[model samples]
Target: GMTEYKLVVVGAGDVGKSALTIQLIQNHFVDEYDPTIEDSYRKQVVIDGETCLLDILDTAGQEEYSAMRDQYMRTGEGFLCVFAINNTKSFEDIHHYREQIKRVKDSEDVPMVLVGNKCDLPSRTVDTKQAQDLARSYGIPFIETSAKTRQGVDDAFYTLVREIRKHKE
Candidate 1:
């Protein structure tokens, strides 16, 4: 039997969900929003020789988007919860995202990584200490990344996979 896995990436819009997926899947990055896709998108990627189907769910930064958020989490296995490094509100609101993840997870909760995108913009970085502490509270790894630099991108995900696979063993 073949082992199969699906990763659902969800976050308040503007966190760069599409950009992250694009980078992983197509090695592409777009700074601004594209007129195409309305709300949801799906892409596939190969990480460490493993095939991963990533369903990018960008629920815009609106309270009304909670429903969609909840729905995605209901069946989500692992998630890369991302927030812009420049946005304070995103860090402040991480609790909701974490809770939704725990509720949706089926088997004693799956792995999640806290990603601070836009890390290239040093001048606008949200409190890294604060975000790190929050992620530590959930026992998850956190990384500040810049798609522009491709910095920490590979390490961030590869590190997370090591953590996840180690748990399974």
Candidate 2:
């Protein structure tokens, strides 16, 4: 069956939030870091040989606007909460992001994935177990990816899309 979904990406600054979204949408990797407020990427992806349309919103990190964040969260049918593998603080911030989304969406079982970006980098700090434990605690998917290398990027989005299709109208 063909369906459309609104997937939102949220995370801390320098976690490669934009890179992951752009990589999936354009198949081109971005090296330089630049902040993005929000960008919607529309694309048709082949999911299990069926056409799936995704409206992915790449949201800003470290920016203030409680009402604005709530607005974005409300429209999302699915979410990708990202953090850099080398940044422990960003990984820790995942809890806050998840809680905020649950609060704004007013649902504990919001379809979401915990993404650990920058997996290709050598200066690693955050471990896989920590992320997996957190995701397990929330009963969500845990995906480790490198936007520059394009590792596990596709799985991240596809997993979230699958989750979205399972819930709501």
Candidate 3:
């Protein structure tokens, strides 16, 4: 039997949420930051020798779309809590996003991954150690990704799938 993973990407505005999603689905880099309201993409891939479908939702990071976030949070099976490594404020926003997801799901053990995107940039205010500490505190995996270079993009999504599978059993 094949299982489908419903994953949502949540982060602050211009944090490269769509970039990571598009990179994983389309296998290319998105250079521009076109604010997204909401978009979904699907792909089938093998994980741990098992074929599974991934339904990825790339959500809006802008505050104006806050109303839509809760609806998706309720249905999402897992989440990629994304932030830009170069932006400290974006990194700080991950806490609120994670809290909202747990609030909607009403579970402390919800499956999630802390993603530090835009790692290819030269300027980074959020250090790797800081993110690691935060993820450790949250008891979730932390991955640094660059949608431009495709670094850790697959691992970030795949890790979330693994987390969801573990949560299921």
Candidate 4:
């Protein structure tokens, strides 16, 4: 027998954590900023025979809230660490994201995916190389995804589960 679990989405504030959760549930894209997640939350979605009760956590982009980040990372079976591909600042902050996750967790071998969000707007990209380099440093996988077009968003979570499944097996 096998057991499946939740996948959590964590990132700096406004990294599309709730948008990605909504897109997966509704199969639709939200083009505007909504103030609903001013606090934080959890949403669930099933994909490719895997069920992820995703807890969309809120760091609210405050480094002082690392205590919150620690709890979320601890609960996640796998993590989709997101950053906007269009912003150089978000791209650069991937380093800090990596460090924070490392610091919060007791084990360094958690399943993680570095996701470059907003792939629908390729004209604004920095490049995939940076994501790749970050992935290399973490020794995990990287995916450039868009929730708007539903490109690689679900795949990123599914891929992470499959890897986790292998470990459980």
Arrange candidates, best lDDT first: 3, 2, 4, 1
- Candidate 2 residues lying further than 4 Å off, grouped into runs, are 62-65
Decide which is better by lDDT, 1 or 4: 4
Model 4, residue 44: distance off in Å is 7.0
List ranges where model 1 is wrong by over 4 Å: 35-68, 106-108
Ten contiguous residues minimizing lDDT sum, candidate 2: 60-69
For every model shown, the clashing-pair count is: 0, 0, 0, 0
Q: RMSD, model 1, all Cα superposed?
A: 3.5
**Residue 14, candidate 4: alpha-carbon lDDT:** 65
Query: For residue 130, what is the lDDT in candidate 3?
Result: 98
Candidate 3 differs from the real structure by a C-alpha RMSD in angstroms, to one decimal, of: 1.6
- The residue pairs found clashing in candidate 1 are none
TM-score of each: 0.75, 0.93, 0.94, 0.78
- Candidate 3: lDDT over CA atoms? 0.89
Segments in model 3 whose C-alpha atoms lie over 4 Å from true places? 62-67
The TM-score between candidate 1 and the true structure equals 0.75
- lDDT values, one for every candidate: 0.67, 0.89, 0.89, 0.70
